[PDB]
Design a protein around this ligand. Structure first.
Ligand SMILES: [Ca+2]
Ligand SMILES: [Zn+2]
Length: 531
């Protein structure tokens, strides 16, 4: 029996909520460390087994003792409560850097020399290509184009939406080149640079991934992983998502890195040329390649994103002829990594009105609003106020949640101002930081119940009780898709289908594209912005 709360903290100007399992209202108090009450109220029912207490009106920063029944919790209120965790979430990307020295003065215990420095062989050939840099994808050391595109897009969108919040954090600054770009762009450039090396100069197509044939032991340090690197074949999905990300990067970097901006624009155009001359073939692992497939049978949303990205990059109305029929399809409007249509919708909506059809544009805005309404109804039913149903708690459920919060916030940039947007964002953070049935903070290195045993090779290699901080784990997954989950979590409700165990890859791994929406959402919460 405990209090469930945001274990990282609460914003002075933000909503403040705790949860408890109870069957009737109870008085609660918030007190100073000496013990004197500064706030008091009554809990109220929200369904399932749950009651909530609202202490939003407490505006004075500090560490308070929350008392309800015979239970106590320590809660922090601060002007920028999430600054440290946002910084850690962004530093994760630098911790994932491949082929670059990470010095101890930046990386502490996890400092290491440049890893995976060898040339990658193109599958089914004797040709070798240098594809250095960028990020290890997850708990493994593969670098995969499709999910990379999402992580880049999310960081770029965070820079575009919340630059002031991001300005207050510091990545591994000394590992990046001077002059230093704004934090999100400094970090994202490393991945963008690597992506550019994955494009085949002859055809404009993009290799699906570069990995070793198989996964090394969970125990393996990055610099000790010396198996041969293989470039898996060019794929439609990789080429299209590369196109979209590069087109996005072209726009965003224009005033910061003109050479990169220009390089990305032309790379995007060459990638789109490839799309036009090739079939929408889903990617499957070649024989002898057992690493992450990142497959996907539906590719029209990738074409949609690429098309809309180039529409916005160029501002040329000719692109709307291709975009608008794709926007009419009943594709899910989601934020990846496989279902990427909402990135395209956003690029379309963020293009000057003059370049697109007014009729189509209003239909797209209207669909977006209806989608958000649906998510808002979900959140209203849920005891923790998050836009989730039991069946949404799948592999990477934390990302499912964060993408949904992100959609609310993105919409505010294109004239769709849903009244639940900022409540949803706060509840998503609350949930991520311990306001859930397990009382689990789903980020390593933070909260009172942090993640301690992530499925992450650098963490497992160094200290299995003390992992790299700032890593957002996948979260509860009702499908029990690893040995540990099957054995330990059968019969538990959806939100309880998580275990902090290094072998539980289906509930407790990490990913660049799980940190990326988290950076966006937490940055939004820091940029406190009503009248
Ligand atoms: Ca797709
Ligand atoms: Zn590496």
């Amino acid at each position: 029996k405990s209090i469930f709360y945001n274990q990282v903290g609460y914003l002075i100007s933000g909503d403040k909520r705790f949860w408890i399992q109870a069957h009737e209202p109870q008085p609660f108090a918030l007190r100073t460390p000496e013990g004197q009450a500064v706030f008091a109220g009554m809990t109220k029912p929200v369904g399932g087994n749950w009651y909530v207490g609202d202490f939003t009106a407490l505006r004075v920063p500090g560490t308070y003792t929350l008392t309800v029944g015979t239970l106590e919790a320590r809660v922090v209120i601060h002007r920028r409560a999430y600054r440290d965790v946002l910084e850690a979430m962004l530093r994760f990307f630098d911790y994932q850097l491949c082929g670059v020295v990470l010095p101890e003065d930046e990386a502490g215990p996890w400092a290491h020399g440049a890893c995976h420095t060898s040339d990658a062989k193109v599958f089914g050939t004797e040709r070798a290509l240098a594809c250095p840099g960028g990020w290890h994808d997850a708990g493994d050391y593969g670098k995969y184009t499709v999910p990379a595109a999402k992580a880049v897009a999310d960081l770029l969108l965070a820079h575009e939406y919340f630059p002031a919040a991001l300005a207050h954090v510091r990545p591994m600054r000394s590992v990046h080149r001077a002059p230093h770009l704004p934090p999100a762009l400094e970090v994202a450039r490393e991945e963008i640079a690597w992506l550019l090396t994955m494009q085949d100069p002859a055809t404009g197509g993009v290799y699906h991934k570069v990995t070793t044939p198989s996964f090394p032991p969970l125990d393996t340090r990055p610099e000790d992983d010396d198996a041969p690197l293989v470039l898996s074949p060019i794929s439609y999905a990789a080429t299209a998502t590369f196109c979209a990300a590069m087109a996005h990067a072209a726009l965003v970097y224009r005033p910061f890195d003109p050479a990169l901006s220009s390089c990305c624009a032309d790379a995007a155009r060459r990638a789109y040329a490839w799309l036009g001359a090739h079939e929408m073939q889903p990617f499957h692992n070649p024989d002898g390649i057992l690493t992450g497939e990142y497959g996907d049978a539906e590719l029209r949303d990738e074409l949609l994103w690429a098309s809309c990205a180039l529409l916005r990059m160029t501002g040329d109305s000719a692109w709307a002829r291709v975009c608008e029929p794709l926007l009419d399809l009943d594709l899910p409007w989601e934020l990846g990594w496989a279902d990427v249509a909402l990135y395209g919708v956003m690029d379309y909506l963020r293009t000057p009105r003059a370049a697109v059809s007014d009729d189509v544009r209003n239909k797209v805005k209207s669909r977006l609003l209806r989608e958000l309404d649906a998510l808002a109804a979900m959140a209203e039913s849920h005891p923790f106020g998050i836009p989730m149903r039991d069946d949404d708690f799948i592999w990477g459920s934390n990302m499912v949640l964060l993408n949904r919060a992100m959609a609310f916030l993105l919409a505010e940039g294109v004239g769709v101002l849903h009244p639940a947007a900022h409540t949803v964002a706060q509840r998503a953070a609350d949930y991520l930081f311990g306001a859930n049935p397990l009382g689990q903070c789903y980020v390593t290195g933070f909260g009172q119940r942090p993640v301690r045993h992530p499925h992450h090779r650098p963490s497992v290699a160094d200290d299995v009780d003390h992992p790299v901080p700032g890593m957002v784990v996948g979260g509860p997954n009702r499908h029990l898709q690893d040995e540990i989950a099957r054995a330990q979590l059968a019969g538990r409700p959806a939100m309880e289908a998580y275990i902090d165990h290094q072998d539980s890859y289906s509930t407790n791994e990490v990913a660049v594209y799980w940190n990326s929406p988290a950076v966006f959402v937490i940055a939004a919460l820091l940029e406190a912005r009503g009248r």
